[PDB]
Amino acid sequence: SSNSPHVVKTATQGEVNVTGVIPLTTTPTKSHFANLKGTETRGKLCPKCLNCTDLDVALGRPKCTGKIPSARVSILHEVRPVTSGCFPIMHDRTKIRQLPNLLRGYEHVRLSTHNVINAEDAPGRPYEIGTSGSCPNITNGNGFFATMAWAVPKNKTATNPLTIEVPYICTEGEDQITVWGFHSDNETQMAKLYGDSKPQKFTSSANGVTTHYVSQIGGFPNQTEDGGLPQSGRIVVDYMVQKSGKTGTITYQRGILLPQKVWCASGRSKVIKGSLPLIGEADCLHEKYGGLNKSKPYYTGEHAKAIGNCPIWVKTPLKLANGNKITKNLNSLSELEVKNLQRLSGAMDELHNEILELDEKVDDLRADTISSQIELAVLLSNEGIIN
Amino acid sequence: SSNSPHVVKTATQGEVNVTGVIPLTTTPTKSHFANLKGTETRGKLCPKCLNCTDLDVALGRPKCTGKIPSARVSILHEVRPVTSGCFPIMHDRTKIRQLPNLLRGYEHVRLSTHNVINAEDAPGRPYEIGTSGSCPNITNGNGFFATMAWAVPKNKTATNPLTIEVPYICTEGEDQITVWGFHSDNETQMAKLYGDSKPQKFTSSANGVTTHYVSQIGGFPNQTEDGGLPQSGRIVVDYMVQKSGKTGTITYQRGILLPQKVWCASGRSKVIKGSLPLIGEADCLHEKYGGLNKSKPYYTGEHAKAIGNCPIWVKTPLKLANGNKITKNLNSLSELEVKNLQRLSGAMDELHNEILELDEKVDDLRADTISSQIELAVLLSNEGIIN
Amino acid sequence: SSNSPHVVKTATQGEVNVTGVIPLTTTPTKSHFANLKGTETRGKLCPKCLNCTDLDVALGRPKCTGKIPSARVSILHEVRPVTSGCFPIMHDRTKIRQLPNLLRGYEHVRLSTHNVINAEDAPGRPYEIGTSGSCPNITNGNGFFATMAWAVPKNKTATNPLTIEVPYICTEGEDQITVWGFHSDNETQMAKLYGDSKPQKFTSSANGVTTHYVSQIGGFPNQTEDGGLPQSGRIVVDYMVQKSGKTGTITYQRGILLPQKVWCASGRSKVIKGSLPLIGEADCLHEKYGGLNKSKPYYTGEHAKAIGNCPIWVKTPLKLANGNKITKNLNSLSELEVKNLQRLSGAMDELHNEILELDEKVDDLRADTISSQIELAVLLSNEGIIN
Amino acid sequence: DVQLVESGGGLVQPGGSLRLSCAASGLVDSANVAWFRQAPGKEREFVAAVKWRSGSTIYADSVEGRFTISRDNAKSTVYLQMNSLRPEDTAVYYCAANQWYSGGYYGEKNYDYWGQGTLVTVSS
Amino acid sequence: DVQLVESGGGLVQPGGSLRLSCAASGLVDSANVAWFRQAPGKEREFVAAVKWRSGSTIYADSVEGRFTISRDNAKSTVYLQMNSLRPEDTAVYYCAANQWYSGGYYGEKNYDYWGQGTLVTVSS
Amino acid sequence: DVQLVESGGGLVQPGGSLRLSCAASGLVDSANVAWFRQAPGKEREFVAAVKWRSGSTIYADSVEGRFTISRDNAKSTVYLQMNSLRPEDTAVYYCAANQWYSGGYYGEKNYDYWGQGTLVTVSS
Ligand SMILES: *[C@@H]1O[C@H](CO)[C@@H](O)[C@H](O)[C@H]1NC(C)=O
Ligand SMILES: *[C@@H]1O[C@H](CO)[C@@H](O)[C@H](O)[C@H]1NC(C)=O
Ligand SMILES: *[C@@H]1O[C@H](CO)[C@@H](O)[C@H](O)[C@H]1NC(C)=O
Ligand SMILES: *[C@@H]1O[C@H](CO)[C@@H](O)[C@H](O)[C@H]1NC(C)=O
Ligand SMILES: *[C@@H]1O[C@H](CO)[C@@H](O)[C@H](O)[C@H]1NC(C)=O
Ligand SMILES: *[C@@H]1O[C@H](CO)[C@@H](O)[C@H](O)[C@H]1NC(C)=O
Secondary structure: OOOOOOEEOOOOOOEEEEEOOOOOOOOOOOOOOEEOOOOEEEOOOOOOOOOOOOOHHOOOOOOOOOOOOOOOEEEEEOOOOOOOOOOOHHHHHHHHHHHHHHHHHEEEEEEOOOOOOHHHHHHHHHEOOOOEEOOOOOOOOOOOOOEEEEEEEEEOOOOEEEEEOOOOOOOOOOOOEEEEEEEEHHHHHHHHOOOOOOOEEEEEEEEOOOEEEEEOOOOOOOOOHHHHHHHHHHHEEEEEEEEOOOOOOEOOOOOOEEOOOEEEEEEEEEEEOOOOOOOOOOOOEEEEOOOOOOOOOEEEEOOEEEEOOEEEEEOOOOEOOOOOOHHHHHHHHHOOOOOOOOOOOOOOOOOOOOHHHHHHHHHHHHHHHHHHHHHHHHHHHHHHOOO | OOOOOEEEEEOOOOOOEEOEEOOOOOOOOOOOOOEEEEEEEEEOOOOOOOOOOOOHHHHOOOOOOOOOOOOOOOOOOOOOOOOOOOOOEHHHHHOHHHHHHHHHHOOEEOOOOOOOHHHHHHHOOOOOOOOEOOOOOOOOOEOOOOEEEEEEEEEEEOOOOOEEEEOOOOOOOOEEEEEEEEOOHHHHHHHHOOOOOOOOEEEEEEEOEEEEOOOOOOOOOOOOOOOOOOOOEEEEEEEEOOOOOOEEEEEOOOEEEEEEEEEEEOOOOOOEOOOOOOEEEEEEEEEEOOOEEEOOOEEEOOOOOOOOOOOEEEEOOOOOOOOOHHHHHHHHHHHOOOOOOOOOOOOOOOOHEEEEEEEHHHHHHHHHHHHHHHHHHHHHHHHHOOO | OOOOOOEEOOOOOOOEEEEEEEEEOOOOOOOEEEOOOOOOOOOOOOOOOOOOOHHHHHHOOOOOOOOOOOOOOOEOOOOOOOOOOOOOEOOOHHHHHHHHHHOOOEEEEEOOOOOOOOOOOOOOOOOEOOEEOOOOOOOOHHHHHHHOOEEEOOOOOOOOOEEEOOOOOOOOOOOEEEEEEEEEEOOHHHHHHHHHOOOOEEEEEOOOEEEEEEEOOOOOOOOOOOOOOOOOOOOEEEEEOOOOOOOEEEEEEOOOEEEEOOOEEOOOOOEEOOOOOOOOEEEEEEEOOOOOOOOOOOEEEOOEEEEOOOEEEEEOOOOEEEHHHHHHHHHHHOOOOOOOOOOOOOOOOOOOOOHHHHHHHHHHHHHHHHHHHHHHHHHHHHHHHHO | OOOEEEEEEEEEEEEEEEEEEEEEOOOOOEEEEEEEEEEEOOOEEEEEEEOOOOEEEEEEEHHOOOOOEEEEOOOOOEEEEEEEEOOOOOEEEEEEEOOOOOOOOOOOOOOOEEEOEEEEEEEE | EEEEEOOEEEEOOOOOOOEEEEEEEOOOOEEEEEEEEEEEOOOEEEEEEOOOOOOOOEEOOOOOOEEEEEEOOOOOOOEEEEEEEOHHHHHEEEEEEEOOOOOOOOOOOOOEEEEEOEEEOOOO | OOOEEEOEEEEEEEOOEEEHHHHHHHHOOOOOOEEEEOOOOOOOOOEEEOOOOOOOOHHHHHHOOEEEEEEEOOEEEEEEEEEEHHHHHHEEEEEEEEEOOOOOOOOOOOEEOOOOOEEEEOOO
């Protein structure tokens, strides 16, 4: 209206002086992450599994197997998760580190109760299931991962590649993840255990996705992320996902860790990355601003992914003209509704980089589009208020 | 205007009562799929090929080779297509089931008239082209697929891996798809046919995409989707696509099905998934509502992909104020133009899951954006009508 | 206003006659490409490297190694780049042709000063680093690529597959690209050089990405894109990208070109494809219209990717009503702000086709959305002007 | 988690009236609640929906000017008032809710929390 | 499939008038029809376009106030009226159409059905 | 490349005034220039931004009413005028710029060219 230190933009008349404004934007502050109000938020994979990480649960560590509660919203904290100690593993030679983050994307996750393969009847038999006391079970003694069976032949000879088929062994509509691997040691020890001293070749096919691996015999890297025990050998661990009703095929040679108890999961869980522990309660979970409580319809700052009762990002501080018409369209602007953005829940940081880059490009473009729409709406509203 | 049981929304004044409205939305009902009006719609791959499926045509079945008519709009009916019966195939060990759906995305599809490789001059010669009476040709007798040549060596010895190059053998600008595979049987039969009883290793490279395969000798899964004949062995079949002017490389051992007649195709065909048979005529093809005839500019319901003279999805039942200005605003809203959304036509369901998930995410985001724009337009229009 | 040969569209009243318009659209004309004003634009990879192409620089040709200046905006000219002559290479059997375009997307690119692997201490030693006078160094004599070491064993025997680990050998936060390959010749020459006449198998793993290769012995394709010297054999060349702090693994046999000086790069460079040479200066770089100088806010024509002070695409010829109110909202339409679109800079044309198709799809959808928003804004503006 | 329980079903002559009820505990200020129905031999179809915060109503064409939906956050219950029932309305009704706004107000994938169901029969 | 045939070409002095014609059979209520031209040694350029249903006209900048486009669905033909021709208009004109709306109105990729061609020559 | 140099820092009592300066050479008609500040032990925070062409000003909430930004393309310098300083404003200020509009006005990733920095201390 008349002269005043408050200015508001209009779609047609541009800048104009008004005798009071109602701010609609606020810049938040980075804060810790809190439990989402009204939804059970997944932090640690198994909260009641003590002294175990997500990779320990995913690989089935002997002393921390337990039920994984279902969750609709989940938090990603470790981009490169680590183990808390069992038989040493070459983590970087495969894609195994992303398995906990893959299971994090499924709402319902459970471990099978029956073995999908009878390890004593697999080709290359007779087998004896060896074990090592690197990671022990409930009673102090030798153990191994619950999702594998270290098969050591009773007859010590070299073999040609052998084939085994992994069937679908749980309810339809649940994608099944099969975890397998192979074990290698130095020359004399492999000559004593398997009867041959040459590298062995492994491969696996599932849904048209094929991988190939060759073992190493000799100098090994120093043990890392394991319960400190002097051991001369170490294992390579991989996983393959099978969809509904689809079987898998594995070709192998001496030193195979045959799968025993597979993970198969269903549903979809909203995944956003953050940090632990979850402290308190928050209306919205912002990927860069931590746990935020919604107080105003819009916010200004660094745009990022969010889950929950969140405000909508804008690029400039918007103001609504002031001084029942003002209240009539104040709720209308506050009642705008936009769908939220999350990770793809199936695109891994290590494996799928171009897809994630395209995803962030789409996120930025949508942010700009909705910001422009909101600015146009605010100009229309306050232009109507002024007139 | 005055008091009335009809209410309309406005961008500025909010809810307002008017004496009559013009509905702009309608909820369709699920119906069968109909031929698209004005465009030749592709259903079956070869409609005049009787007693044959899409995979039978793609693999080149002896008794139903025929011309594939060109089409701009195509229908996908089998997510996991099956064969109607020839020599048994290990369907799930490769990506072969998606070949008909890959050919479905090309407007012009044809089979070559000359062999891209002279099978009798390939490395490992002398060869004799073996054949089996599992699927016969026009006159009852032994035959085989038109896109392969089962090369059985005349000299029965084991061989080291051999290399052959697949040249570009059709018009430039047409992507060429090469179909190849290998054959395996049990121990004594392979010792009698090929001279060796060890698994054979195969690989192929094209455009930097490489696959590796190892054959199986011994227990085979039960025959499925074949013309019932007792066969002790079965084959694995794969395909590789070469772009314009690019050759391919194949490494192989005993038991190779060398390519003979490749598919090369050009153009782009709009692919939407549905069900057969096509009954009648429809203005628009909705992926979930079947064949729909456009009657109103907008519709409310489950948003999905559509091809043709289709209405635009909205989330709420919009209404237009009533009671020549009204007529002018009705045509303007009815003449809005939005381009339609289809499948990627190159992303396979079995192989590319993250890309399809990102595609559906983009689909939903565009649906929300367009719905918001349409709602804003309707509020502006009826606000102008009231004033 | 009154009767006049100029018409303008309105959001509510539709068509109306006005006594004069201000055009806001113009159709450009294809022109050559010019240097971007205010930004150093990257054309050739090493402009001061004479008689060498981008693939010559990337592989480290002996006589044109040099510093690569940093650039924020880059130009892609060769979809399938070629070499200017050194030892013959089987270009199409791997993904090597896209390495210059991959390095093109990084703002800062430099070559390491120390060897990441001591070639004389690698497994299979003792080695002697052989060389050929196909591409010579600064003083006329035998040389080889700066990023490889052709290792010829001093003891001539066949070997089982051997393993070597490639460490991270530069500053953190810089992705490291390791270039390696293998060499093959005919039967007698390979028997004289390496002691065996059987094909050798190679594989490599990095970040979960694995490739497999088998060499060829015998008939070779004719030499192409090499300095004409009769050579009976040729080499296959590949590369792997390692992220921050991640090592790589290589398995190999006789005839390995071990990596010496890797490229590791950081930053992001805007990449748009075009043609050389860059002539003159231009405000905006259009992917189809060449170097364009911005004169009006909007343009009509074939929409494509652009970098710089560019106008915004619209589908129809917009006009602004005429005859301070007109000037007040003329700048408001001229001050609309939209983010640009570029290539993914990580998606290769040869390797990643579905992602590029989705990128073009989302680009088209954004173009349509922004055009619709601009048209709505123009209708609102000129409707306000008329009233 | 939230709890959804439906009550008020029964048999009514065609031409009368009926009211349904649904008690929800644990809803937040951004939740949405909807009613469904499934005729025998058919799939569930959208009937109505209201917003837990502002109370905006979305009613399907088949049942409009006759049905109505409302909520009372003081009693934490949502009602469905039925007028002029016809024998084509006989079905099994359901109460559905979600925590925050989803892709659309129609369909079953948009809503996450589902109620057990009540039986409504219309006959003369 | 639809059929596009062009007629009405010939030689005309610079400063006169000319009218082209194009008969299309099989068009639907959502189709678009456009005119093109290709000077010798150059590529095709957009000239005009009209909506088959509503009749909205899009004219390229070079031809405005001088060319005009219109359709008559009763006769199933589309016309192109030319006024004040200049010697730079000598080219081969084409008739193009597509079934539904596409990315844009300019270019050859948006239009799918292509007519055979007509020769127009301007000289004194 | 462009050059950014900051001058005008020093020590001022709480309640006074101060003006900063930043000379930029090589900016184009579409560039953006912004001011930052970094308190000891914290990260840089947005302070203000202005358009090189039109002169539209964006101010963060902590600095509004008190700070102001302006540019003079004739002298190729951008100023930052400070009023009513308080001891919480003591930090190291920076001058940042980019050539064309990026995703947002807030943050360090949007701006590309960085000034060396100046020291401002407020004490009694
Ligand atoms: C624990 O490991 C020991 C090792 O020998 C074994 O004897 C015992 O049966 C195991 N118990 C359980 C419950 O796994
Ligand atoms: C191999 O591993 C065994 C395991 O204890 C170790 O004793 C031996 O020293 C290692 N090296 C050799 C050369 O055997
Ligand atoms: C059909 O198969 C028989 C099998 O021996 C062969 O002799 C004959 O030539 C084949 N005919 C055609 C037309 O392929
Ligand atoms: C292998 O296949 C042949 C083919 O008929 C069959 O006769 C034989 O029984 C099979 N098994 C063995 C062990 O030879
Ligand atoms: C150039 O190559 C010759 C070949 O024998 C070698 O002796 C010389 O040291 C090389 N010089 C440089 C600078 O690389
Ligand atoms: C193999 O390469 C050598 C290299 O000069 C050549 O002399 C010879 O003719 C080639 N062929 C054979 C069969 O050795």
